[PDB]
């Protein structure tokens, strides 16, 4: 199926406490594989996935230099936005960026993107056409104007079609045993009493990969999506994910409710009950 290469970047100012904290975190699909943190003792790009041991020392040196350059550029951006928005130099502000590309199972580019946010709000974003930008406010419009005169979209598009796609293909190839695996979810149902002769039934799905999964509760063959409660799929610290969805049912009738689990690692969906 399709795969993605994404970089989550964050620059955060802290007036009176030194330089902004700058961080880059990279993912191939749902797997963290590289990271840069300016607050580390000796800031360097570091591998976060075992298969990245396959890159030579030049890789790390070059990514570290790129990161330090990005760090300085963002330090400037923070000051620039203070001017665009007429804000004080005493408060903390945040710049966020998500950049990446997705390829199909054949390795060809499917889509690319780049979005910026200032203080948690949309700032500027690349349109699907990979040619123009859309600005959320008048400050971002200044940036859009600078980027159009500089050909920023064209440069980013060349990165997407070239560097992004090619290295994504290389990462999938090198970390194939990890990134192309499928860890089947293992499910269980827990039971908890409630006041009013009602029971909480909680369906758990553990140890699965990739992260996409569907957990539903059924009664009379109909999904109770409406009254269902749950948590966003979450990482479990070893490269796998977990999730749970619950429903409140009448005591003594738990047996009529069934949990359904659909995942890539389940040839046939799972069906369980208390």
């Amino acid at each position: 199926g399709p795969h993605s290469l994404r970089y989550f970047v964050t620059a955060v100012s802290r007036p009176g406490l030194g330089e902004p904290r700058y961080m880059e975190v990279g993912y191939v699909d749902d797997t963290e594989f590289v990271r840069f943190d300016s607050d580390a003792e000796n800031p360097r790009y570091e591998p976060r996935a075992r298969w990245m041991e396959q890159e030579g020392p030049e890789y790390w040196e070059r990514e570290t230099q790129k990161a330090k350059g990005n760090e300085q550029s963002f330090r400037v951006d923070l000051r620039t936005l203070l001017g665009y928005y007429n804000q004080s130099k005493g408060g903390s502000h945040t710049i966020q960026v998500i950049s990446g590309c997705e390829v199909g199972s054949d390795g060809r580019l499917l889509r690319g993107y780049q979005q910026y946010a200032y203080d948690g709000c949309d700032y500027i974003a690349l349109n699907e056409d990979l040619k123009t930008w859309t600005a959320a406010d008048m400050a971002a419009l200044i940036t859009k104007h600078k980027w159009e005169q500089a050909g920023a979209a064209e440069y980013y598009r060349a990165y997407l079609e070239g560097t992004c796609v090619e290295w994504l293909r290389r990462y999938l190839k090198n970390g194939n045993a990890t990134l192309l695996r499928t860890d089947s979810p293992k499910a269980h149902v827990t039971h908890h009493s409630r006041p009013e002769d009602k029971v909480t039934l909680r369906c758990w799905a553990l140890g699965f990969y990739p992260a996409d999964i569907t957990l539903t509760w059924q009664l009379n063959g109909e999904e109770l999506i409406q009254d269902m409660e749950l948590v966003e799929t979450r990482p479990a610290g070893d490269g796998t994910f977990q999730k749970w969805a619950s429903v409140v049912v009448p005591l003594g009738k738990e047996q009529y409710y069934t949990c359904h689990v659909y995942h890539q690692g389940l040839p046939e969906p799972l069906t369980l009950r208390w």
């Binding site: 970089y7 970047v9 880059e24 990279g26 990514e63 790129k66 990161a67 350059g69 990005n70 550029s73 963002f74 400037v76 951006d77 620039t80 936005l81 710049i95 960026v97 950049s99 780049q114 910026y116 940036t143 600078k146 980027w147 500089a150 920023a152 440069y155 980013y156 990165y159 560097t163 992004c164 290295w167």
Partner: peptide
């Protein structure tokens, strides 16, 4: 590999 970001 990441992109070299452009100034705002």
């Amino acid at each position: 590999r990441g992109y070299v970001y452009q100034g705002l």
